[PDB]
Amino acid sequence: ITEAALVRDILYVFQGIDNIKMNCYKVENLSRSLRDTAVRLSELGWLHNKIRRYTDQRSLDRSFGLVGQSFCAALHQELREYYRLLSVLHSQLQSLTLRRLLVWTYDPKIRLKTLAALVDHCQGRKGGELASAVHAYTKTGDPYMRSLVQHILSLVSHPVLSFLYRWIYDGELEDTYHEFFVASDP
Amino acid sequence: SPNVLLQNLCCRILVAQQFQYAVRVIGSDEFLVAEKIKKELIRQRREADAALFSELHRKLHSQNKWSILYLLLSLS
Amino acid sequence: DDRVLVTETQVIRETLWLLSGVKKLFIFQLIDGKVTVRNNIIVTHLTHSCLRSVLEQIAAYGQVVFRLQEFIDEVMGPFRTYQAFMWALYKYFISFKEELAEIEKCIINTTITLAIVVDKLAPRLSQLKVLHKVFSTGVAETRNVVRASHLLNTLYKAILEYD
Amino acid sequence: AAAAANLNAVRETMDVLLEISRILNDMETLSICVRLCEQGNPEALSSVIKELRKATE
Amino acid sequence: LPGTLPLASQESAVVEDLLYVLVGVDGRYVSAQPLSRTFLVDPNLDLSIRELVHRILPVAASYSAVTRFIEEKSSFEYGQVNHALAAAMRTLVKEHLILVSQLEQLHRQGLLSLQKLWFYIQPAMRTMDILASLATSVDKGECLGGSTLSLLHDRSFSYTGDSQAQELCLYLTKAASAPYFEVLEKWIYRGIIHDPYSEFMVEEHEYWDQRYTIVQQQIPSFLQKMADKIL
Amino acid sequence: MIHELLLALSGYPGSIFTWNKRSGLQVSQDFPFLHPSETSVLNRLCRLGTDYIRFTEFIEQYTLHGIYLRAFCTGLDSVLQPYRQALLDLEQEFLGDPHLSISHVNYFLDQFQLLFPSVMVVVEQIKSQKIHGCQILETVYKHSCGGLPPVRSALEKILAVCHGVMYKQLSAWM
């Protein structure tokens, strides 16, 4: 079991597709100095399968609402980026090793650690209450996270500021799902 | 050959005194260089450009290399 | 099983001839007034079956243009209406032929492959499908006064559908 | 035939190098620098280029 | 079985084993022991190797005690300073995860003898020996808010002539004091005091000598001169 | 195999990419030349092809009748235009450098993968409830207030051309 085979499978565990199988990705021989780094590197997939499933499960029912969907949609432009980096890495496997991969995927282990922990803090939040629970992640100070979440807020809070600029200049609120904080009585 | 190339480079950059100074100066790994370039790009940030640079480096290998990369990094 | 293993550009030239309405082509050999793809055609790629798929669609378009050319032939070799009707059809073909002929110029003298010539011909393969339905009511019929009345009335009805 | 293939490879390598320079930022100067780098050091060449640029200014 | 193995070659096996322990993951021969981390190398190894290996490992122990300060002091029950001090102390660990990669690439070529390792890590043995002394002087006396900013102004004055460990402790203080200084720019230019965790020097209450009171603990000891004009 | 796939994503199925009338486009079985891990991403990629085929089959069939159904399909091809145009491009990039893998091809679709799914049930509600007449100008509108920016920008185009019919009839009557 060479080192080139593990790099062949790891580039697929980064997506969810499983030597390395499926909560840790227990690998099943080879030397101990290899299994440990594989277990560590594969931790990026378990952060990727969870975020993709959340966006998918919610992209099925229309019960989430306009604010929720916007946040869910914002989780795809931050996944195309993760789907591009893999393509450049994939073209070099034809040289890179596990040590080289660590200096490559050290940053996207953080973005895939805020997003994979931003979709759990706001689970049942439907409507503006979601745009208020992705704003409670800006009080963090970390200049790398406070400048990422403060961008998803700029997309999630666009539908909210769409009702507001409607319910102020025209006074015609319209939301079949109850999101706006102004509730009308028939 | 190398001396002629240096003279041509000095001419492109621009005389005899400058060429003499260049001659005196002349008379006077790859993975690490790539990591340093990525770190410099991060400081500049930006992130998208760094991803493109990694793809470009792989293409160059597919088609010495460390020395060329170091000169480019110095120019910044 | 043996196959001819034709090149790639040769197919586009053949496809242009099918669009032109010419017969006796190494590909799309008709048998009973129904153009049909051959069976030994294969390219280095496309696994010998997708080619039978993509050609099968263009063949369906050849039928629309081969039948019309058979119609114009049966008028040249004093109804004053069919003869006046083909002159409109014939006039459309010359202009349509010029676009197909022009493309052939850019082939001998830029890369060109299958998926490009088709999408370039979208606003034509659309206009052509209409004629397969307008003319279908001008061919399914005996007296000379009912064949010309029922034809001329089909147009004025088919236009109000597209308004 | 073989010579033509070598020429195509050199042209492709030069284009890739130019793109890398633009990202970290002419072509004739880069070609001269690449030939010098292949012969042999890199830090010294960078210092000479910087000094020449200062003199031109 | 390094005992039944030649001398000049087994050194190249330790340098690849030792080339991992510097990252944290356990190795083949140089293993770790359950927890200040103490290691064991092997019973039957050459005397002129172990006495040299045990000189490098104080950069592994000073790393198995800083990454345990990052993975811990980033919680929300610490304030807005024990966070930034744990982020600006995480950019460095990245720059140590790269200095392990370059040698690996060089080793793939045989150019890394054990005697050559003991030279390259010399700076990474001195930096990881400062971060493993702040991460133990911040937990000795529980510091959060201001007292964890007084320490980073005295541990930066004690190194007034080193210039290799003062350009560092001046990067931590300059980064572990922006969150404290972003509420100060709300208390001087306006009256609002956010300070969700009780860490700022001034706390409000609920006829006016009792509303806002100076807290004595959370004074940064470099604003001590102007501890009155602030309030 | 690249040019083989770029046709399968166009509406032409072959031996490698079989076609089933119920499930949709899918890979037949394991292939020795390619890796056994790709057999998944393609299946993830075909979930897009099935949409275009089931689209164009419905577009041609025109099926129910009424101008507002004719114009809906007439507009439905307009939103579907950037899909085709972005597919012609993939061949050009592969014609240049022969070092691009399926990963990059899968990456290029990106926007189409998150658009078709939301614009698939709009068609299904029509063919499953016999939505006849001008009632389409609401069934499409009730889904125009969606959160997804790309969708909010797609259906609005269809409503922008479907109104052209009413605006034609309305002015013809008034």
Listed as own residue / partner, the contacts of A26-34 with beta carbons closer than 8 Å and 24 or more positions apart are: A29/A1, A30/A1, A30/A6, A31/E28, A32/E26, A32/E27, A32/E28, A33/E16, A33/E17, A33/E20, A33/E25, A33/E27, A33/E28, A34/A3, A34/A6, A34/A98
Chain F residues with CB-CB distance to A65 below 8 A = 147
Chains with ≥3 CB–CB distances under 8 Å to E: A, B
Tell me how many degrees the CA angle C51-C56-C58 measures, rounded to the nearest 5: 100
Chain F residues with CB-CB distance to B62 below 8 A = 99
Task: With H, G, I as helix, E, B as strand and everything else as coil, classify residue A27.
Answer: strand
Chain C residues with CB-CB distance to F95 below 8 A = 111
Q: Which chain B residues touch E if contact means CB-CB below 8 Å?
A: 29-32, 35, 39
Give CA–CA dist E50/E41, Å, rounded. Answer: 7
Contact between A142 and E176 under an 8 Å Cβ cutoff? The reply is no
Task: Tell me the H-state helices in C5-143.
Answer: 9-20, 50-76, 82-108, 114-120, 122-134
Write down the residue that tokens 């700076």 correspond to. E123
What type of residue sits at position B47? E
Q: φ, ψ for residue F52 (rounded to 5)?
A: -65, -40
The minimum CA-CA distance between B59 and chain F, rounded to whole Å, is 8
Contact between F162 and F136 under an 8 Å Cβ cutoff? The reply is yes
Q: φ, ψ for residue F118 (rounded to 5)?
A: -75, -25
Task: Say if the Cβ atoms of A88 and B31 lie within 8 Å.
Answer: no
**F115 CB contacts (<8 Å, ≥6 apart)?**
F148, F150, F151, F154
Q: Does A117 contact chain E (CB < 8 Å)?
A: no
C163 to each of B36, F132, F149, F166, how far by Cα in Å?
66, 19, 33, 12
Question: H-helix or E-strand containing E179?
Answer: helix E178-187
Q: How was this structure determined?
A: cryo-EM
Structure tokens at E143: 């510091």
Give CA–CA dist C71/C87, Å, rounded. Answer: 12
Q: What is the DSSP string of B1-70?
A: -HHHHHHHHHHHH--HHHHHHHHHHHH--HHHHHHHHHHHHHHH--HHHHHHHHHHHHHHHH--HHHHHH
Q: Which of B38, B48, B55 shows the shortest C-beta gap to A91?
A: B55
Euclidean distance between the first and the last CA atom of chain C, given in angstroms as a whole number: 53
Candidates D48, D49, D51, D57: best to mutate against B (most CBs of B within 10 A) is D48
To one decimal, the resolution in angstroms is: 22.4
Chain B residues with CB-CB distance to E112 below 8 A = none
Task: Say if the Cβ atoms of E105 and B35 lie within 8 Å.
Answer: no
Give CA–CA dist C109/C119, Å, rounded. Answer: 21
Q: Which of A70, A94, A174 shows the shortest C-beta gap to F147?
A: A70
Contact between E145 and E180 under an 8 Å Cβ cutoff? The reply is yes
Nearest to B45 by CA among E170, A65, A147: A147
Q: Which residues, listed in sequence order, are joined to residue E203 by a DSSP beta bridge?
A: E213
Chains B and A touch (3+ CB pairs under 8 A): yes
Give CA–CA dist E43/E50, Å, rounded. Answer: 10
Q: Does A103 contact chain E (CB < 8 Å)?
A: yes
The minimum CA-CA distance between E36 and chain A, rounded to whole Å, is 22
Contact between C127 and C63 under an 8 Å Cβ cutoff? The reply is no
CA of E76: which chain A residue's CA is closest? A140
Give the number of other CB atoms < 10 A from CB of residue E76: 11
Write down the residue that tokens 């480019």 correspond to. B72
Candidates E105, E107, E111, E112: best to mutate against B (most CBs of B within 10 A) is E105
